[PDB]
From Swiss-Prot, chains A, B, C, D, E:
Binding site for [2Fe-2S] cluster: 56, 58, 75, 78
Pathway: Alkaloid degradation
Protein name, UniProt field: Methylxanthine N1-demethylase NdmA
Source organism of this protein record: Pseudomonas putida (Arthrobacter siderocapsulatus)
Gene: ndmA
Gene3D superfamilies: Naphthalene 1,2-dioxygenase Alpha Subunit, Chain A, domain 1, Rieske [2Fe-2S] iron-sulphur domain
Keyword Metal-binding carried by entry: yes
Length: 344, 344, 344, 344, 344
């Protein structure tokens, strides 16, 4: 509904590069993806990742059932070929005739970063960037891109689940927190460069596995849905970074991505993947049970919900500012609001 | 919604006690149930059966995914603990802060009777009672509670199917009626104490199994959806009672309950259970086929439809009286209307 | 619904005679079918195929769960018996009482032809006929009725797929066309007696199987959805006829019928059936991908789309004429419009 | 085991012609079949149906995964081509070299008759013929070949089930016999030309469907597993022929064939197919329950079992005679033994 | 069993390191594997990969259902702890008593190499080594370990399929060879250091995909089941290495491993993985059809089968030498037999 239009102005991940390469035996795509209820197709056309509407201009077949040919995407039905700008450049049935002026499909800003493919549906405000991942190009850290995981929950509810200090004791007792560490601190939160920044020192000496990323937590949250969590672990005295971002596929579904990086990397990737998967399996049934899918005004917050409250407040401001136009939105997103004592 | 609001004032069964005990290994619940399209949770807190909306006040997680701890139902997400009145009495994240006054969920009338759990969503008219089961506390009779059975049919259509004299010869020829006995009598019907009361002396000497409850039929039907049928059986000269009641789960679904009692009880419970299941299997495809799900005004009645006609008329009066308020509803439900020669 | 009302005036196939005879052990039906989102029942009563709304006038049970009893269709619930005109002639519960005037269900035109059962929902314009199959009662030809095939695509899109000259090279390269023969001719198209008639000499010497019906193509397309394609095959110098017609089951679905006839018939029926199934398997994914299901005004045509363009034009004229009434519709359907040199 | 060797000398059906044509899109086969635990392949090579062992001489691949090429069967692995005599005639890898003398596979006598494909594994005694079907080439009769049906029972037990007069009342009460007609007559049985011949006049006026083939029964049973039953029906005064034969696939499995012919043929084939399928569904669970699969010496016969007793006696004689050689076997099979008063 | 005993003297791969790390959340195992019908367990104890019989000495529980605890493998039933030598070092029920001398399980050679785990069941001849992979520690090459693929075919038949020059034209026509290139050369074969070495210049200019490893083929085949194929590709003038090895799981099954390395590595791993999977899908049905599973003496060879013929000859020599003992086996395996012009 109208509520969601403002989200079209952000970059969202739609697939891993691995998913694109696996989709078709050519390794070039095409791959069908869905973002904010739009049916799109991604393909590697020459040196560029390209996103188009997954709908041929001729007779509305899905281009995602087609083939990459040179630097073009060829429709399966009558072979029309589309260039990187979504323009048809070949109509095989009519090689001599002029190509109709309207023989084109919409294309969208599309970039690879961190091993994911990102799409921005509306670029007209031109003030948003791909989220920040702190571990990129840090040679001290081994990076693992997990396979995406799908939840029957919204990106807003997923974000709040990831940053929620209060649930660890109840949803993750064997795994992330002691069940008796249920009272979290109230942390200062800064807005800077379109990111929420805040720091949380979790309890020490908790009976949790050594591969649990538990320690001093530094969050950099690129609004609206990306979370970069840098952990200085207590047990190993080493850096562990979690980068989690949700693709808002439609009104009730998320395709979620986790990339994690670690300084101590002589151990098995699957030690960590299995642990992450366990954490997600603990969250999933409870988060999918939340109803209605979008948080209504009747939910009852407590002081420990500060992160959730401030998140909802900023999202509300972004939605209102989007209605006022590009300049208002840019200010709402990028104006600093500092409440900690840190330098910037 | 509007057409069904009056049904919120009655007691409806939502599960058997056995279902509640089996739902969770604690034997205390919780169990998710649905009544009139409302999502509810049932649990046993101490000596009390409780029913609440299945939605935590904090972040809307389902309490039915939580845990009973003595006299509390604990939400699975952040561990809020609700007492028997639906009030949160512990917020683990803020154990010293005052609990918000809004931290409460709607609590509904919930009572065990006859081995079923009954819920009344609205008690404001204070004039409805749990349906009458004649065999309760008759020490002459052995009582068996069947597992519930789900039909893709409404409670009104199920009620009419149960009391329909004309269909026996076509739906139950091997089983309840001779295929020749298609013409039923037109019987007097009395309203008394919120019940329809009527008697039907079925045909004798029909080629049906001895466990068929066929004989003199005395109906006591607690409006809107319960039927107590006392059979003085021809074949065994002994009493057999069928108590059938439909939970209106939503606009197209019923969860149905059968409790039956018998005076001759030296035989197997499963002789009777299998017979009841055969009868229901004969009804099910035809009743599920009726469309639209609610009887529309264009259905064509004949004189043999008296029970159906009178039932529809009383339901319409109750709907209309509910709009006029508590006193009008009490009169529509509880005023006597006597057609027969009996006194009550 | 509103856009589709004009389609109710045509004869559409709903099942094969084989399907009707297999539906029930009596071989007389009843069989439930769906046409233009209407739920219907088909049965053979005496010598007549009948079609009625699949909904008893009494309590709305499905007559398709009932039984043919001589010259009657009997409802399963209370045994009301309907004659070939849809009128109830027996109410078993009240066999002496007058039958209500309202005890009737809607009866529709229903006729067997070519081994299919055809239904016309609206006969008020009295100007449509069952489509033309040229091989009927041609003793030189062996006729095979294939089993129906269901597609998640509309009847309009299926028709255009069948008559589309341009896609053969991309969808059927191994099978019907050389992949290099992508440029089709622009052929004259005649409207005559409610049929599109046109001829297409396909390319010779293509590397296609001997059982591929490739040759001189003569189309007689009974509007709106039936195609009679007479092929004078290059490879065998013999006649092969394809008759394809789509049942518009609802807004997203077709039940499609293929009947084929051949002059050289000493070979296996299954050589041809397997080839037809291969062609259909090649088309199915691409046609089911077209979205939205109904072609929007934004589709971009090229000159090679003449058949599709002219088809859409005639359908629009018929939809417009239907709003103006019976004589306007008759004119739009049956007036001749001749482009070619041929004489009719 | 050794018990079964004698069965290799008879013709057995292995598939319908329809199954062969459907197996491969060429309609020529190949089709894998199994007979007396031998893995065979059938193909149409030119004008001939050919059966070979399903095992290439080169590297033991299954020829049934190959292709018919001209009048040869081509192995899928390295393309060796086998002629109608099982001889390899092309080794693609070594076109100039002589083909090895041992490059051949066993072939077996293979013929089409009545729309089935028949194989005789051992032709060395040269005294057996394909079973007799009385309706072949009788233009008064419409013939229907049913799809094969598979049972977990032996061909001997299937034969005895088909000719058993005593079970109709218990396995087929609604369907073939009145439940009170349980006492059958003791009929004379003749051996003539390798066939058991006997006649049985079933009870009249039984409450069975009109499509039930009930009447005067004349059996011609080509030993060991084929039954030709000619029924002069009581209800319709018309001829109905049932031809049933079992393929002994292995020690515990049969692939069974039914062909039926009828003089009154204006009705639906599927009336009869559905009835036959119902009969088979009534027999199947009981016959599959018989254990051990081969009848042991401890079974207890009664006088009503005459047909079964005489069948087992003749099979025993054939098994013993096979051990004594070709002349003894020919006499055991073809010597007449007459006990009725009929002409031959 | 008897025929296969000699295979116990070689190193066979049983799982990838990835499979071991994924088996249990600890990433240390245990993992159940099967080799030559032996049930084994693999675990990482400290720095060592260990393999034991998967059967506790106490009450025969599977150790693969247990847990790694530091330098011990702990049985799930009564917690006996086994050291890297298969000796029990803790009996929790009797922690003071002497541990029985019989409280030990069989321990087998187990080593990681190339990302696979290798087991040698019998080390008594002390003359076999883990197979040679030429790309190991070649920094010019990117290495990809595929997931294992399981075939219902033996290791011998899989080896012959991989090195078979003749089948490419029939099994892989679109994919590896022109269908016309059916005649292979007869190449010299050298035995050196327990390897078969031979070179094959495949045909140039074939219509095969660019990612097809087609070019100059140099085989180094570590007996009995590992093949190292170095391809100097015609199409890219670059090195591509295929390392394929079969685990003989039991008498009918192989778990197969492919590792591939490539010099031009800027392209997608999944271009190559998809192509390898296509090749394997083309081979699988034909190789699984070969019967009996072990090649019998009756198979008929042609001159083009030189590689297969020489392979079977060497395997027979090794089986014969094994019966004569350690020094005979060492000689048969490691003595050089040079046919070519090359120098080693
Ligand atoms: C929210 N969240 C996670 O989701 C998570 C985690 N470690 C692993 N995961 C997967 N930590 C520490 C965490 O806070
Ligand atoms: C409606 N109804 C039943 O549903 C029924 C029954 N006996 C068993 N059942 C289950 N009888 C007598 C009956 O009238
Ligand atoms: C559209 N179409 C078909 O669908 C078809 C065909 N031959 C078989 N089929 C099934 N031909 C020639 C054809 O043009
Ligand atoms: C054994 N048998 C049948 O199996 C059968 C049948 N009619 C149909 N079937 C199928 N009859 C009359 C019969 O005797
Ligand atoms: C046997 N074989 C293969 O199995 C193969 C291959 N390339 C990929 N695969 C998988 N080549 C060239 C090959 O000869
Ligand atoms: S629908 Fe894409 S080319 Fe025609
Ligand atoms: S949602 Fe229930 S405690 Fe938070
Ligand atoms: S619903 Fe059809 S007879 Fe009653
Ligand atoms: S296995 Fe048949 S040709 Fe080689
Ligand atoms: S069976 Fe292993 S410790 Fe007992
Ligand atoms: Co969580
Ligand atoms: Co009923
Ligand atoms: Co097509
Ligand atoms: Co039988
Ligand atoms: Co191969």
């Amino acid at each position: 509904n109208d509520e969601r239009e403002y989200l079209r102005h952000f970059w969202h991940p739609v697939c891993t590069v691995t998913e694109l390469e696996k989709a078709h035996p050519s390794s070039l795509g095409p791959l069908a993806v869905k973002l904010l209820n739009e049916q799109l197709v991604v393909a590697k056309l020459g040196d560029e990742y390209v996103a188009m509407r997954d709908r041929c201009a001729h007779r509305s077949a899905k281009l995602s059932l087609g083939t990459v040919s040179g630097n073009r995407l060829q429709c399966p039905y009558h072979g029309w070929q589309y260039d990187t700008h979504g323009a048809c450049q070949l109509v095989p049935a009519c090689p001599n005739s002029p190509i109709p002026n309207k023989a084109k499909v919409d294309r969208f800003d599309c970039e690879e970063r961190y091993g994911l493919i990102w799409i921005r549906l509306d670029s007209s405000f031109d003030c948003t960037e791909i989220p920040y991942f702190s571990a990129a190009n840090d040679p001290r850290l081994r990076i693992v891109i997990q396979e995406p995981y799908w939840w029957d929950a919204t990106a807003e509810r997923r974000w709040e689940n990831f940053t929620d200090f209060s649930h660890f004791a109840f949803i993750h007792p064997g795994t992330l927190f002691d069940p008796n560490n249920a009272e979290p601190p109230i942390v200062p939160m800064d807005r800077f460069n379109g990111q929420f920044r805040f720091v949380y020192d979790t309890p020490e000496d908790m009976a949790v596995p050594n591969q649990a990323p538990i320690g001093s937590f530094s969050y950099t949250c690129s609004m609206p849905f990306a979370i970069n969590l840098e952990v200085s672990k207590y047990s190993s005295s080493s850096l562990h970074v979690l980068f989690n971002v949700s693709c808002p596929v439609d009104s009730h579904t998320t395709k979620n991505f986790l990339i994690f990086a670690r300084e101590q990397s002589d151990d098995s990737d699957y030690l960590h993947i299995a642990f992450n998967d366990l954490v997600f399996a603990e969250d999933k049934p409870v988060i999918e049970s939340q109803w209605p899918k979008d948080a209504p005004a009747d939910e009852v917050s407590v002081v420990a919900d500060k992160v959730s409250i401030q998140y909802r407040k900023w999202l509300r401001e972004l939605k209102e500012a989007h209605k006022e136009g590009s300049q208002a939105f840019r200010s709402a997103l990028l104006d600093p609001v500092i409440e900690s004592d840190r330098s910037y």
